Structure 1
Amino acid sequence: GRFESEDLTSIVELDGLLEINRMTHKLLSRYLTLDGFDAMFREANHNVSAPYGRITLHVFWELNYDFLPNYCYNGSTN
């Protein structure tokens, strides 16, 4: 939900946050029986009964409304 309210550059934060959630899952799974992390993620990403998750859809939304029209490429620095 945080990612859906930020621009494309915030996807690095999303990834780091997801990794913390994965770690939290691992730590908890030593004592509790939880749904597989991937199953939890896909459900939250609405990517279980649908082909494209919320992350993919938001990436495209941002490309269309922000990246393409507002960004300038620098070939020397990439």
Structure 2
Amino acid sequence: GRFESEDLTSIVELDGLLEINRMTHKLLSRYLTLDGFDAMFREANHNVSAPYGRITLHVFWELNYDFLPNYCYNGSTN
């Protein structure tokens, strides 16, 4: 949800937070039993029962609305 409420530049933040959550799951799985992180991630992304999740939908929405008509490219720096 936090990613869905910001621009496309929050992708790095989402990946970092996801890595933290995965590590916490690994630490907790040492003493407890829990569902696989992939299953929980798919559950939160609404991807288990649907071909596409929320992250891809937001990326498409951001590309159509903000990124494309508000960014200028520079081939020298890519």
Bin for the TM-score computed over the shorter chain = over 0.9
Which has the bigger relative contact order, CA under 8 A and spacing at least 6? 1
Give distance in 1, aligned partners of 2:15 and 2:64: 21
Deviations 1:20-48 (A, max 9, x none): 00000000000010010000000000101
SS of the aligned residue for 1:49 comes to: coil
Give distance in 1, aligned partners of 2:7 and 2:41: 21
Give distance in 2, aligned partners of 1:33 and 1:39: 14
RMSD of aligned residue pairs (Cα, Å): 0.4
Q: What TM-score results when the alignment is normalised by the length of structure 1?
A: 0.98
Unaligned runs of 5+ in 1: none
Unaligned runs of 5+ in 2: none
Q: How many residues align?
A: 78
Q: Percent identity?
A: 100
Give distance in 1, aligned partners of 2:66 and 2:31: 44
Q: Which runs of 4+ in 1 moved over 4 A?
A: none
Q: What TM-score results when the alignment is normalised by the length of structure 2?
A: 0.98
Quote how far apart the aligned CAs of 1:7 are.
0.3
